[PDB]
Design a binder for this molecule. Structure first.
Ligand SMILES: O=C(O)Cc1cccc([N+](=O)[O-])c1
Ligand SMILES: [Zn+2]
Length: 257
């Protein structure tokens, strides 16, 4: 099955998921000089005051912080979006070293990590139906750089020891994702895909310009996770990022001047 190695990594995914070579794949490089300011874009509305996290999961590819998405409790709206998109989970992608890890790049710059807050369009009723639609998901992507610690991330880092290996979960209630957001909500947006199989072309991407800062210690704890299951040969969970894919016939739009 797919993963991030030599033998099963991104460069192989097309064999089981031919949409890997599609017209609207993600991530992409954001060429800041060619992304045009679009005055018709709105401010993003991130409403996470009632978000109800339930659990954290090592799925063997990353870890997921999961939310109760059975009511409109944590929603993303506005920005480039029509309608209302409910938060279901967040996760990250990161590197073996601070010089890589992000999926999107900015003028070819790779950040140490990238956070993805995944939301589904309520007009499709559930996640599984939403991923079948071109406007089914909105993913908010936030870059991480290494510097000052992010106090709001620490709760997540400290639970990771309990989900070291693939298939482990742990209760993770009352975590507030507002603590992961940067000051500005300036963004780039473009139409794209999931960045892991099945790579479905169902995402409006909203990538924030301003990274968050996390400490070296925090990211080092991400890198102590394992791709393998309990008791199997240890292979550190690092470099779980898909590289930039061809932009093809897409425009990246900027919310800011
Ligand atoms: O489980 C998976 O890898 C598929 C999946 C599910 C939800 C979000 C995703 N994304 O690319 O942001 C991908
Ligand atoms: Zn992701």
């Amino acid at each position: 099955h797919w993963g991030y190695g030599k033998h099963n990594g991104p460069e192989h995914w097309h064999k089981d998921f031919p949409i890997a070579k599609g017209e609207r794949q993600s991530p992409v490089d954001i060429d800041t000089h060619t992304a045009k300011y679009d005055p018709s874009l709105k401010p993003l509305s991130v409403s996470y005051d009632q978000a109800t996290s339930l659990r954290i999961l090592n799925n063997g590819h990353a870890f997921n912080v999961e939310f109760d998405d059975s009511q409109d409790k944590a929603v993303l709206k506005g920005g480039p979006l029509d309608g209302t998109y409910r938060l279901i989970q967040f996760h990250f992608h990161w590197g073996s070293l601070d010089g890589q890890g992000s999926e999107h790049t900015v003028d070819k710059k790779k950040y140490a990590a990238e956070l993805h807050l995944v939301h589904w369009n309520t007009k499709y009723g559930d996640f599984g139906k939403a991923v079948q639609q071109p406007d089914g998901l909105a993913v908010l992507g936030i870059f991480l750089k290494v510097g000052s610690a992010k106090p709001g991330l620490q709760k997540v880092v400290d639970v990771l020891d309990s989900i070291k290996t693939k298939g482990k979960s742990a209760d993770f209630t009352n975590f507030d994702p507002r603590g992961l957001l940067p000051e500005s909500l300036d963004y780039w947006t473009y139409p794209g895909s999931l960045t892991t199989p099945p790579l479905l072309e169902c995402v409006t991407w909203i990538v924030l310009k301003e990274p968050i800062s996390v400490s070296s210690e925090q990211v080092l704890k991400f890198r102590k996770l394992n791709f393998n299951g309990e008791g199997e040969p240890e292979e550190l969970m690092v470099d779980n990022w898909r590289p930039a894919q061809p932009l093809k016939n897409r425009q990246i739009k900027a919310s800011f001047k």
